[PDB]
Amino acid sequence: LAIKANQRSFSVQFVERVMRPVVRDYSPFDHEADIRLEINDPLEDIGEVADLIQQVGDYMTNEQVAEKLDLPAPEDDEVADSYRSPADMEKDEAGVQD
Amino acid sequence: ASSTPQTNVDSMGGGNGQDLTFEDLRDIKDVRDSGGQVAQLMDYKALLNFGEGCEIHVEGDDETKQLVDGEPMTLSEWLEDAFPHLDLLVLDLGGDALWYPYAVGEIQETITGEFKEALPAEPWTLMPESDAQGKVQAWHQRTKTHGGYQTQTLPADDLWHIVINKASARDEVGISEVLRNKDEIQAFKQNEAAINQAIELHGFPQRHVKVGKEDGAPVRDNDLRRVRTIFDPRTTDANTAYFTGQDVDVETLEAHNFDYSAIHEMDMRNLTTALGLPLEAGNVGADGLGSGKPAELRFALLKLAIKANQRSFSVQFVERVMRPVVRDYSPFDHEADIRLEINDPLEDIGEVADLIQQVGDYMTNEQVAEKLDLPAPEDDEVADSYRSPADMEKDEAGVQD
Amino acid sequence: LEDAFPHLDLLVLDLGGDALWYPYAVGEIQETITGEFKEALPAEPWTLMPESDAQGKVQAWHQRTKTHGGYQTQTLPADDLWHIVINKASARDEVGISEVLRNKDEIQAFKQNEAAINQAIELHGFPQRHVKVGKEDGAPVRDNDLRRVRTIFDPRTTDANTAYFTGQDVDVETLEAHNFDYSAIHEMDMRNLTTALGLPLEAGNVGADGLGSGKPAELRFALLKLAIKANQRSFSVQFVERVMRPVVRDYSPFDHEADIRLEINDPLEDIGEVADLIQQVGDYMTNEQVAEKLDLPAPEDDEVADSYRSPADMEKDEAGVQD
Amino acid sequence: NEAAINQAIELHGFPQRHVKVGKEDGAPVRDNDLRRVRTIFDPRTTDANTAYFTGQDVDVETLEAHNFDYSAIHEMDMRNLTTALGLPLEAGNVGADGLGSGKPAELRFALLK
Amino acid sequence: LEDAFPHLDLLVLDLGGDALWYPYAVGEIQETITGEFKEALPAEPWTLMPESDAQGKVQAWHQRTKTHGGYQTQTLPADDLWHIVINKASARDEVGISEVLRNKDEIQAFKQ
Ligand SMILES: [Mg+2]
Ligand SMILES: [Mg+2]
Ligand SMILES: [Mg+2]
């Protein structure tokens, strides 16, 4: 909680008074865009995340899983937005008698 | 059957404002500013109550949908745009309302038209003036300056104030938990100082050289100066040896053992319990209480206390800062069913996942997404279903399960 | 009623708190500037005392409040006030008992023993230096002589690694820290106070051997839950009967004789234990009964709400094959 | 027995300072002389790290806190009262070895039910 | 932004470290010899102190640095500098608190 409070306080402030001025002054983009910087939790357990994904992956889109699991989102938006696994969808290109 | 409430409210008008002087308020700041163990404990209280962040809900949000910036927003989208860093504001004000009798601030605008922010004010600088029915009718401000102090008064119309700790309903001015416990805080600091001074004197052995024969010739100060020069601990080293006549004795003041650990554990127990924290927050522990139903009770009590503070803050923040912002700067209905809710700091998502495995068959996909702290499904038809969205996708074809 | 009492969770904690401390919680019913119900508004319970008739019913309320001078006094006809009593001597007791006043002697005993320990730690918890000067049966040493010795041996200016050189006729004695079991006195005090206030020992940051385990644990936590249930039911009945029903008469188009219940949540539920139960015997519970135990909204369609097999199982029977 | 323990803790639970003044077999010290010594050694105005400087004919003795097992007296009293009122021992915030386990537990909870 | 801030993981650790030790992390925005953004460039926080207006906003920055003799002094318009405060007394506090100066007494006690 103390780390989260410090991280959010730094992140908001870094975006608002160094990233946004750079987007005004040196960039062809809109500086009013919804930029967030986020700073990683130092004490994550990826095994605890993997356990969670096994228990309730059936309620998470493939992008939500990739986000929690700290991976790039899937290549195709159609599978990224699906709930069932990308491996399960590939396995449904043919496949029989499971 | 009353418009004006017909029951009186114990107003100490003989005490001008409340009996809280600016010096009492500035002494709360002195405790907060000072650092060390007591300040860190009250920071842990703020972080438990408010550090896990927040979410805005509007009951029936979908029906609010309106073209604001020529494009669609519901009131939840508009409020999320209006209060973009609400997690910081909630931790700041929630902190202030735990230390001081209130958090307090003003509503600010852009140079013409739109809402800027809800802007806090330094709570030690401000005290309320109350009417005979206990309502704050004006705010009085004293601030440090180029000279000593400057003084200011404000009509209580564009300020807002949140009270967590209060004596009762009707109490619109609240209580500082610090001033309430000042005697216990003083006791803690005094015992800490007593231990530090006792370690300095008694925690370490000291050399006592005795010179001359007992019932023999007396030794004067100039004689002891030469002996001091020989036995000086400044220039002695670990493996120095001494050669003497029989009439020189190297005695020692032993380190006189006392249980400063138990005194610290006692002090910390007193302070943590006085501040309503569990003993564990003070880096101190107790036997048996770490286990079973004894553990379950104290952590249940902590979560109940947090829940009470969170609800008291959340209701009040909506009713006297979010709703006024919706009247003054917004195209939506201010009478809409807005709720702020502040996250439980001590959730176990593994326990939630275990629950969803056992009884997911009785929860809609939206109820599951809510418990699991995720966005609701994209299509309302699947959101409202009871069987998993992955199972419904699997039923686009699928065979021999 | 949910629209009439939007923040009832806060009101219940406020009044329930007051009715445990004081003999009663007490307050009034308020209206908007014309017409509608505003709120049930509490009043400061230390400021109000009831006047009882010969049959023990409260016939009037008497209020004393601090003011610009000393005190001002007020009297109210007990018609638009309402009051909740949790702790009472019996039925017929319409005025109730303060649990604090009832236990005042034990609270005093606790505070006295606490003060005694703090003073004992200050005097006896820390060793103190005793320098003795002069030879035994020798020349006497006067106060002005001890002032110079005090200046040498001053604990204020001494540091951890100071060394001393003396003639034979100076003795640096010590008052040891004289050991006493203040921890056991605290445990005893806390046991007395918690048991007097009907809380378990564990609430006081104090614990007991064996009592954390097995049937010994189960009994004390059962006793706590029974005491809570008794208070909750006593408050709930009374809140409905003498504030919610009057509001339903005076400001509502509904029947005040309707079967209203307020119920207050159990603080010590284990949702995992409930989920285990639903797995074992869900096959005997309707979907509404499951949703009630599990603390969820009832299903959207009454036909599925009233069914015994899961709503997910019924959805799965919209087609589905080869399970 | 409860009142007796509270009084015993007050008198015997805490150590007390005994300053003895004058030389043994020496000149006597009168009440007005002890009043001035009391003023020097007063526990009311003493603090944790006070130091004392004296001639040889002043002794700072102590009445140690004399150990007695008030916990066992409480456990005995509570066992007496709970059993007299037909409640299990556990109701009084007091416990017993072995009796929390197995058939020994099952009997007392069966009796209660 | 990923192209503009290629080593943000190091910058965040440097500034985040400074903003925990000192009342603020502080720095400037730098450009290539003509046109494009170079980097957000930190500055040594012990060398810089802010000047606050009556409303508590930093209106100028004041800099003292060691040199060939003793010290030289510099002043900057607070327009092209930027500064991050983690530890602060309240909102409105734009100058922040050093956690070290706050705990100096406890640090001295430890070392002694
Ligand atoms: Mg001689
Ligand atoms: Mg003589
Ligand atoms: Mg004589």
Numbering used by the authors:
A (entry chain PB): 339 to 436
B (entry chain PC): 31 to 45, 51 to 436
C (entry chain PD): 114 to 436
D (entry chain PE): 226 to 338
E (entry chain PB): 114 to 225
What's the paper's own text on this?
Here, we present the near-atomic resolution structure of Haloferax tailed virus 1 (HFTV1), an archaeal virus thriving in extreme salinity.
The empty structure corresponds to a postinfection state. Instead, a plug-like density appears to cap the portal protein. The structure of the PP itself does not show substantial differences between the two states, indicating that large scale conformational changes in this protein are not required to facilitate DNA release.
